[PDB]
Amino acid sequence: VDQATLDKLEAGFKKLQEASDCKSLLKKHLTKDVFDSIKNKKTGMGATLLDVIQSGVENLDSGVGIYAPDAESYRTFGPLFDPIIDDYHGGFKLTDKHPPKQWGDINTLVGLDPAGQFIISTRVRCGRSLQGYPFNPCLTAEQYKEMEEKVSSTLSSMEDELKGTYYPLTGMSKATQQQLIDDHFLFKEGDRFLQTANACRYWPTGRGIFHNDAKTFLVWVNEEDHLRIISMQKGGDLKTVYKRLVTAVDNIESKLPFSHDDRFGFLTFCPTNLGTTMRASVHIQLPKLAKDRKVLEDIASKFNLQVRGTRGEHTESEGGVYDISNKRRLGLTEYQAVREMQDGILEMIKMEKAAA
Numbered sequence: 001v002d003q004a005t006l007d008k009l010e011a012g013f014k015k016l017q018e019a020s021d022c023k024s025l026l027k028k029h030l031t032k033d034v035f036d037s038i039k040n041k042k043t044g045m046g047a048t049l050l051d052v053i054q055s056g057v058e059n060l061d062s063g064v065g066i067y068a069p070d071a072e073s074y075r076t077f078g079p080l081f082d083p084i085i086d087d088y089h090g091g092f093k094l095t096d097k098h099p100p101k102q103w104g105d106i107n108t109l110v111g112l113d114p115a116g117q118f119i120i121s122t123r124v125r126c127g128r129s130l131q132g133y134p135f136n137p138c139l140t141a142e143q144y145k146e147m148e149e150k151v152s153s154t155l156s157s158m159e160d161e162l163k164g165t166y167y168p169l170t171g172m173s174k175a176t177q178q179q180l181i182d183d184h185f186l187f188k189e190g191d192r193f194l195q196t197a198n199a200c201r202y203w204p205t206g207r208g209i210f211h212n213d214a215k216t217f218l219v220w221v222n223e224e225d226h227l228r229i230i231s232m233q234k235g236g237d238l239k240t241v242y243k244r245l246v247t248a249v250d251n252i253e254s255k256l257p258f259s260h261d262d263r264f265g266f267l268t269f270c271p272t273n274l275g276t277t278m279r280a281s282v283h284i285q286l287p288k289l290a291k292d293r294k295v296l297e298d299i300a301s302k303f304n305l306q307v308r309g310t311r312g313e314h315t316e317s318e319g320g321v322y323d324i325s326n327k328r329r330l331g332l333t334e335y336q337a338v339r340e341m342q343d344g345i346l347e348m349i350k351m352e353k354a355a356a
């Protein structure tokens with residue numbers, strides 16, 4: 001680690017201390033001891049502590065504030081990652097290891113809202129990293145192009161329900177891009193948390209989206225993770241949505257090598273996405289319970305759920321529509337993660353019906 005970087009870290013640490021109302025896990029867990037213990041360390045790819053905490057230093061409204069530039073970072077900077085990961089995922093000890101992949105019995109999942117008055121749409125995503133490629137901040141432009149080639153070529157072999165077409169962001173019309181984002185299908189462009197993590201270099205080179213014609217099965221290429229594999233549709237038929245995701249991921253896994261860690265399960269760029277990498281969500285209206293989004297969030301938290309705005313994290317609810325999902329992804333199985341959403345949403349709906 002050089003001097004210019006040390007200077008910036010000391011100043012960043014200072015900034016976090018002075019931000020009396022900053023509530024990120026970065027601020028909470030980057031103690032002086034922790035800070036001093038790892039600030040002079042560097043990975044084989046040259047990732048430093050600055051590359052890890054910079055997004056959280058610059059964006060004090062971060063909930064977490066850190067990312068892993070490469071896989072090594074998770075251990076090189078363990079003293080910071082470890083407490084943050086344990087905290088976010090609701091208990092995960094130094095000696096704990098994420099369980100083996102287990103989709104569980106899909107037939108035990110139910111329709112989340114049969115009368116159709118609360119839930120708008122249901123979505124399940126996972127993320128994967130390609131073996132042999134580091135995370136965004138360590139990628140070159142050429143690697144983005146190489147990965148895009150590997151993934152798009154693989155997805156051309158999908159068949160039946162999953163058969164579809166790859167659409168590069170490069171050459172994509174502004175109108176087509178904006179509509180896909182508005183309809184909740186395509187990742188947004190220009191995220192300040194990702195940008196400051198240097199996760200968006202060379203944009204839009206290598207970025208794009210694959211989907212079947214119905215857009216119930218989608219794969220994001222080279223956004224936050226190398227792949228995000230998504231199943232979604234209108235309504236509350238979680239069983240179908242989840243079954244389609246399982247089929248797609250099992251099939252893609254036989255073709256592409258993805259990075260998996262004995263302790264952290266599937267590796268991802270953000271520590272919140274480790275393990276199952278799974279975020280199962282609904283877009284839902286709960287007018288009585290949502291009469292104050294902070295009350296809504298307090299209720300959700302007891303069910304281990306997270307509340308986001310309509311256009312994703314770091315956005316507001318529009319027209320009473322909230323994104324509610326399992327928060328935890330690591331230290332529980334895929335089945336357990338999706339069941340936390342199912343169970344929590346079914347009960348929150350019951351509470352809404354009962355509320356005055």
Ligand SMILES: Nc1ncnc2c1ncn2[C@@H]1O[C@H](COP(=O)(O)OP(=O)(O)O)[C@@H](O)[C@H]1O
Binds near residue numbers: 122123313
């Ligand atoms: N249950 C859902 N139904 C429809 N669209 C959804 C649902 N949950 C999330 N989305 C959309 O997914 C996109 C990604 O949002 P983000 O909050 O960035 O999720 P991720 O963890 O998938 O990256 C946004 O456009 C958001 O509207």
Ligand SMILES: NC(=O)NCCC[C@H](N)C(=O)O
Binds near residue numbers: 055061063064193314
């Ligand atoms: N909504 C979320 O919890 N997103 C995961 C972390 C995103 C961003 N780096 C943050 O810390 O807010």
Ligand SMILES: [Mg+2]
Binds near residue numbers: 224312
């Ligand atoms: Mg996202």
